[PDB]
Amino acid sequence: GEDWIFLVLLGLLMALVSWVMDYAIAACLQAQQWMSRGLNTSILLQYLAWVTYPVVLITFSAGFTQILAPQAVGSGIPEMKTILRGVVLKEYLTLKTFIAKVIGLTCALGSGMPLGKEGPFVHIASMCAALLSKFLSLFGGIYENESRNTEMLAAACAVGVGCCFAAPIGGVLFSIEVTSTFFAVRNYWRGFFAATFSAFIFRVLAVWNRDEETITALFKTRFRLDFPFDLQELPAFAVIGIASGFGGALFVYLNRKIVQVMRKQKTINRFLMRKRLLFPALVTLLISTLTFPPGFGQFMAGQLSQKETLVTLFDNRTWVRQSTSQAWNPPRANVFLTLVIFILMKFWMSALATTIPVPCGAFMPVFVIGAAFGRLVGESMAAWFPDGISTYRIVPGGYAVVGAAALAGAVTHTVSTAVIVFELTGQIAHILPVMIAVILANAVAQSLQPSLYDSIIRIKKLPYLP
Amino acid sequence: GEDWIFLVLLGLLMALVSWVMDYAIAACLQAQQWMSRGLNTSILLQYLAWVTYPVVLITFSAGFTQILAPQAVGSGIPEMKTILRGVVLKEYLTLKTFIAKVIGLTCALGSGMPLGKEGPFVHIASMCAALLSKFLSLFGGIYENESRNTEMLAAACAVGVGCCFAAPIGGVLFSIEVTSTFFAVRNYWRGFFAATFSAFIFRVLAVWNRALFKTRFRLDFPFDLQELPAFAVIGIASGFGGALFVYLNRKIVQVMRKQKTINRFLMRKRLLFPALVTLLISTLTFPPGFGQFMAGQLSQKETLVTLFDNRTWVRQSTSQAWNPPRANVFLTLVIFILMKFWMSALATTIPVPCGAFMPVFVIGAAFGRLVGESMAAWFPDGISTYRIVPGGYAVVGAAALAGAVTHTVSTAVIVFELTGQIAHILPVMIAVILANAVAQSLQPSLYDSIIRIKKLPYLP
Ligand SMILES: O=C(O)c1cccnc1Nc1c(Cl)ccc(OCc2ccccc2)c1Cl
Ligand SMILES: O=C(O)c1cccnc1Nc1c(Cl)ccc(OCc2ccccc2)c1Cl
Ligand SMILES: [Cl-]
Ligand SMILES: [Cl-]
């Protein structure tokens, strides 16, 4: 069957495209730190370099995107949910939109702005499906139909999320929850088949490389295997779920409220529609200025990238017991204050930064806010019970995994975040805690606000089935 | 909200029912061992006790089923697939059918017979859902909607498979793949909710009155990239074997229909078929006789716990059962595989409440362990500081053959929750995908094959 040649080529090309983008994003983030370490000659020369380099990468991302393909701003998922519902869009799967996203996303993330890649990876995979089916001319000529287009793009959304999180089953399951309302079991088998082939290519690349480029071997946790938690502390993992449900409902509300204000302020909007590159540059300058380590970044671990922040929050050691915890315990504050200020600052910075005219997603931004809030509860438990909830003392890094999944699930309207965190953290010992928090987060988030992508659909005035 | 009160109570009742049944099955299997070791002075009395005890339990299970509810016979997935397509079955969700499935399955599994409970748990959970939805005051001709009822029967399949395997996510994904053609996202959220409340009650009971198959392999370099062809061969060979099982089951049912004089002779004296097949299996399972050459002294749980063992056996514990003084590990695994294959295809046809997942999962574990131990014999120092892990190949082969028989891929998710580890994920998915690609090209699912055999409303 020709469809099983299509799905191995769709799985091969998205693994290469993901690995090439990740190599280019890392080189951009490393150059910021090298430049800072070089320019320790004066605080003003170090500050000038810290604010300038992000603003140059974001200004180039917005300008280059506007020149090739103005359709390439924002996330794929809220359009793909309408393309699979049978609605044609103007230029969306064309090679100019591919070139615009692969270059424009690499500059948006390499700036060090608080931005995700999931929605963009769903669009880039769908463009690989479309452009593949024409480069080898499988489409049009031989009994081809809109049904076969929708069936090949649905497996591409599954490969898109699967390559993003390095989570081959949880990516297939997440794609179904966000793009669809009924899914064929035959389409879940085709997603699972192509996702498994993308996973195989990542192991070959990682074996040919020095390491997994996904730090700590794809965020692999190293907690104890025996008595990792007690039934006496299930009431704490439940309060993470509920609070993450309210938190994710506020994030989606605030992001829509920001866009509605920029549309309602018509005089400023007319000025900015002439001055098209001004708004993305000013937002980048503000965020980089507050993240400046010698000024205010010391109270937010501002010197860390988004990988480095999450690798630190998932450590097996306890911080409140009297390697990178040093970024959370500066000479002027304790770890609890630094967690509370990081949570409060990253919340408004991430609801704002995702509105700017660049290719960007939003899942890693809410995943790290959730991990920090989970770690705040975990260290607070380890401080209240210093030697046992007897003999088995508390493990705060396992509370961070539960908070990550619970806030990401509330914002997304999803339960496959539970499956992703097992494949990602490399362990299953916290399964019951994760599933209680994730279902409590969804039970109250779905009672308060739509999903993030359903807000983006209604903001963009795409055709909506509630 | 009435839907969450229902999905809490359904998660509580199926977990309580599952626990009381596993207590009663373990008691019946302990009685067999006590009675056997109490007779170690007389081989003849020990053989008489060994074949009589299971023949009595099966004869009672068949007889008690045929008195209360003949519709309670066999695996309940094919009828639930048919009822979820909107076909009506007469008395298939009633209290007589429940009592017959609960007691009949307890007696059928409390015996050495190669039977499972996956299909019976899908039926028992659907009876709990019917009884709860009949009990609650929102029952009546204004609100007994077929949509409401079909929505809860779809969640009850997920609770039943979740309680069966003790795999709360994998049990929802398997229920979708076997009972449905469209994965509705709103019902996959209900399956996850109700499977969570059962997993909580299971741990509360595991404190106050005390998955079970948890493994302890390396976290560092458990397999090399040089080994993926051996996990692929397991998937390919597991595709042909999983197709052969569905064919062999159907041929056995067609032959007992075909031969008219034998058919009518047995149908007049209905208990002679389940009694005489139990007697032949028990006679071959008798340990001082032939049974030592197929580990006949272990139960199904005790067998599977030895197959997932973290040591290599071919280096040259209950796992000694695979190496009697007269035969090695390999010969005992090959004899086990071939004898269990025909015994399980046959035993799942007999007139008692029985499923078929554990019998195929165990043959896959022995076939996987056989390939793992072959690799560990061929590569004594690694494919170095790192040696091969044969118990990981047993997890791969067990996941692949259960997927090829059932036409599912979510046996990959089940195996990580059972084993408590996710390090073998790439090997498992490659073996499962090869096993389904090879099997779907040859035969229907075991459950579709039963729909054809039973002349139910098929839909390819
Ligand atoms: O931060 C860095 O140093 C970095 C370096 C190289 C490449 N990417 C980096 N970061 C990054 C960002 Cl900004 C957004 C998304 C993301 O996707 C995977 C993922 C994994 C788990 C949860 C949620 C998303 C990654 Cl890995
Ligand atoms: O054998 C015993 O000593 C035993 C004692 C008490 C209760 N059950 C026992 N066995 C058993 C049987 Cl017969 C059928 C099904 C099953 O579980 C579902 C499952 C679990 C893992 C893999 C694949 C299926 C179990 Cl655990
Ligand atoms: Cl992301
Ligand atoms: Cl079973």
Author numbering:
A (entry chain B): 88 to 409, 419 to 485, 490 to 566
B (entry chain A): 88 to 297, 304 to 409, 419 to 485, 490 to 566
Manuscript text:
We determined the structure of CLC-2 in complex with AK-42. In the binding site, AK-42’s phenyl ring nestles into a hydrophobic pocket lined by F306, F463, F459, M460, and L524. The carboxyl group of AK-42 forms hydrogen bonds with the side chain of S392 and backbone of K394. A third hydrogen bond – between K204 and the pyridine nitrogen of AK-42 – also contributes to AK-42’s stability in the binding pocket. The exception is residue M460, which moves ~3 Å to avoid a clash with AK-42’s phenyl ring. Notably, density corresponding to the N-terminal hairpin structure is not seen in the AK-42-bound structure.
All eukaryotic CLCs contain a pair of ‘cystathionine β-synthase’ (CBS) domains in their intracellular C-terminal domain (CTD).
